[PDB]
Subunit: 349 residues, 4 copies
């Protein structure tokens, strides 16, 4: 979806006075055909009859004006109503996939002038916005909220299973008993979960001001999930990987590639064929996840800790003194690393 | 529900252009009577008047055509509109349980020709599909989603209680303090939960593309429940049972038999009369559940481990060396079995 | 709500063909006035004009007949339609709180004959049923489900807080560190929760077949709550109390008395004035809750265990041999009591 | 929102007979213009034509009367209907931001007389109440419940993350390993959560009797959150702070100030610049939270315990005897403090 169109869709999103007028118009079953232009003069060839108003815009004015036949012409910044009751006459030979005079006129005019044309028919409750060669159907809030509420419920279920996987993985990691299967399973669930977020995103945007609660919920449910997945990648990839690369792995599995077990283990640098092999590959966390998330050591510095001790297993054996030999690790960091890992082992394993 | 009919129901499921036209028709309160035929020629006896169109199908075309009285005739693959405004005249002596000319005509024609006939009346918002001697009422998406959302909430509650039962059962199993009552109680909840899934299934299918989120939720909620229940059967049945048999027990209690305590304990091979006796029967898990789910040992091989040690109690006492004497158990499997069971005991009991 | 009326309300509950016809009638905005009689003959004085049909009942027939003015007369068992289009003429001097001829006629006739009279007006979507001097407004399913879904959500929140209270109480009980405040707080939440169930009950019934999922949810959420609360009463009441009495305490606090802290502590036999005193009263569980729920010892026998050891504190110190000296406690029960309590202490405290 | 207006809004809230009549009027699409006056005589200048009724008020009467053009005049206590079908004639030169004669008349009359004027138009389903220079749009219950149900779901998510933060903070506190970042993070989530409650409040009120379940849910979800946050403030502020001050911090961050990390750490008395510094500031709880919430020691007395031992760290080391040296700490309190803290350490750390 071109950003160019996104900017236009904002014009008729829940919250704006324009959308306010359009909803009223839908409820009254009157029709509407609105043409957004910067300078009316250069468009007089496609504007016939009607009335010249050149007055300030308001939702009430638009609604009343729409009781008459024909089209209304507004300024692109929706601050002025220039015409009402006019006949829009774009070139009839322009191709159109629309049905019914109102929408065919809207599409051709948008294509012809490169300007925005809004159509609202009587036999339906949806807003169609035409911009250049683009068409965007705007749904009603009730419909959007229904889909979004279901997507959120679906997310809660994925998050729950994700929390359960990560919790079990934590036990295994602390006991150094992890297998590639445990990692991939956890990654897959995470990838699939963030995929849902990406898919519902266009719905949230379309909700405008009425999607505020929905955004808040998505934020609380997927808070640190992305950071967590990256750290998992940095910790279990076959060979060392920088954060930025882990992020590319994440973005890739969120949109491009499908999060299938074999496919994830492959990108992680493991040469596997059948998913049955995953339960046989033993792996050891490097310790980034725990270092950054629990010991609160900046990644930049964790790099030094990992380069020296290699794995979480070794770091958990290190002493306060042993850890200070690391560049960037003082008394506080050293104690923080040692104590937080020891605390976790005593509680979770 | 014959699969034969299921194939026809797909034709008018949410997502198809046909359903798109039918919804529009419902919203406009126009009526509709659609007859699906392969070759119009051999049906000219039941097709009177109207107009010959022989044009490409589209939802907009169907909607417009439906503004006229009579019926529309389409190709079975919904790619062609052959007739519009015709009078369908099946044999009037054919029995019909329908009311009102439109539905009586549809049922008799479907019965007469063995073809699909779709009826949509003005005084209601539902689609009736007739195929041979079958009738399928298609509900609106709003209604379906309402029932499905309630069924999902109901499932969440059953799953929660199931998780609680399984969690307590786990403690008991690790402490070798299980009674038949603990097993049956856990099985019953599991059986009842999967029963809900089976019952809501026809609703999910009827939802078509709009049931995608619902499917995802059902999948996250009942993920490994079936495998888990089978393993429970394999572990607590009075006498050894092969997986395939455990599965038959599952399928049976999901559809045929009622998951009553006594009834489950009976099928498991225990001769009980009153539910009060269940709290008195001590039982010991064979160890399949833990072997497959936690130690990740293939069932095929677990069979060997169980045939040698008999119960989880004995396996938990076995040593790495003792376990390797089993056919198919190497150093890795042996360590995996021993360590995962020891880890669980230290954490859960 | 008299059971007598409940039986009549079933006649028009979701699921019945009668309600099916009434919903259709509501959607069409036609009106309806239905009079249910056993023998039409003895009511000819209040039945004028119309048509004698004496035909078999069906929803389609009722719906069609309702397109005409006047009333319809059916058999009490809803198997026969005796009249259609008649004028019902009860005594006009009979008092009525209704407005509009249709409802005034219905109420007076029901009062006059002691029979059921159903009225459905055009300017609204609700069914009014009149039986003798009773009036029952039947709501639409959509409305009912909305209230019921909210009540269920509200219940989930109370159950969660209840689980948290009971969980903390469990720690305290095992450590013999309980105070009257911990008990009352847990009881109050339980009482309030079951109060919600009682209040939503009339809604579930009114839902008929469409309240099946709602019932299942209420059952999963409040499963053993009543038994649990009774045992809590038996365990913390100032002086010994029999189960049956504990139950009266429960029923009382669910309907009659308000579950205020002081009020609960008072009924439990503690003479307190200000809620501040509750945190100062130390109490010890007798052990019924744990004996019945965890050790699975029948109450009848727990009575003997409590009469001998007095408190959970003492039972937890008892030996297998010490416990067998109790009448009804064998080797199994004795082991069950001892091991389950010891297991709990090792895990929760 | 002036309380003065709140009192008027109650007049038309769900539950009242007046609102009952207004809903019926909305469903019928009749219009309504109601003027509430104490003494009709002194308003005869703005009341023209119509009918003098001087009869008792009822919803049915109001609904029927509204079928006629013009306005209805009721007594301020909604117990009397004085006029029906009248022409209200306020001064036309009074400014009005309304459109359409009905609303312009209502606003001007309310402004002119300082009395309540209720307007309901045909082309919409909302009630507009005018009082003096105020205007309050009353929404339908369906709309309100939709927003409120979403706000509750959003709250559940914030509460869950809050519980997780507080749970981890608890471990850290018991191990005396807390950093300013852990405290602020927990406070921020708490502050944001209570902010949602404040924002949805006007919706709950507008729901009237239909907002009962919603209130119950908000109460169960945010129960002790405020007390908990205050205690957190009292425990981690840079320098000692009295409860009343902690409360001002809470109220401030709930409405005025934005709960940004730096902003919270600043108000707590810590001079920080970049959020990165928070992970470096070690802090120790004074012990109020644990003393009041777990040991059940009144704040008034906790003040003495803290003034003597200073931190939770020191209190956890204190002996029963050491604690009794505190003014207000007896054998019970002393044991309660010592045992509850020791119990927590053994279970959570």
């Amino acid at each position: 979806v071109p950003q160019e169109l996104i900017e236009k869709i904002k014009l008729i999103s829940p919250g704006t006075e324009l959308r306010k007028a359009l909803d009223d118009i839908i409820n009254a079953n009157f029709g509407a055909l609105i043409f957004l232009v910067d300078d009316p003069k250069k468009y007089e060839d496609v504007i016939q009859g009607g009335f010249w108003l050149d007055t300030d815009f308001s939702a009430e004015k638009l609604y009343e004006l729409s009781k008459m036949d024909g089209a209304i012409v507004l300024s692109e910044d929706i601050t002025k109503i220039y015409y009402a009751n006019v006949h829009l006459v774009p070139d009839p030979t322009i191709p159109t996939g629309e049905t019914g005079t109102r929408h065919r006129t809207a599409e051709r005019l948008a294509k012809q002038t490169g300007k925005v044309v809004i159509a609202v028919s009587r036999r339906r409750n949806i807003i169609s916005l035409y911009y250049k060669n683009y068409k965007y159907v705007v749904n009603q809030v009730d419909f959007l909220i229904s889909k979004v509420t279901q997507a959120i419920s679906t997310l809660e279920k994925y998050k729950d299973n994700f929390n359960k996987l990560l919790s079990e993985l934590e036990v295994l990691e602390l006991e150094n008993r992890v297998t590639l299967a445990d990692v991939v399973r956890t990654l897959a669930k995470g990838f699939e979960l963030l995929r849902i977020v990406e898919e519902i995103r266009p719905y949230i945007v379309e909700l405008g001001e009425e999607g505020r609660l929905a955004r808040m919920q998505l934020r609380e449910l997927t808070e640190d999930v992305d950071d967590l997945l990256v750290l998992l990648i940095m910790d279990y990839s076959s060979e060392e990987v920088e954060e930025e690369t882990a992020q590319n792995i994440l973005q890739d599995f969120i949109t491009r590639r499908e999060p299938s077990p074999i496919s994830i283990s492959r990108v992680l640098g493991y040469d596997v064929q059948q998913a049955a092999q995953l339960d046989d590959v033993l792996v050891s966390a490097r310790g980034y996840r725990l270092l950054k998330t629990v010991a609160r050591i900046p990644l930049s510095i964790g790099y030094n800790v990992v380069r020296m001790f290699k794995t979480l297993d070794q770091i958990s054996k290190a002493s306060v003194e042993d850890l200070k030999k690391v560049e960037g690790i003082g008394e506080k960091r050293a104690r923080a690393i040692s104590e937080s890992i020891s605390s976790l082992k005593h509680r979770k394993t």
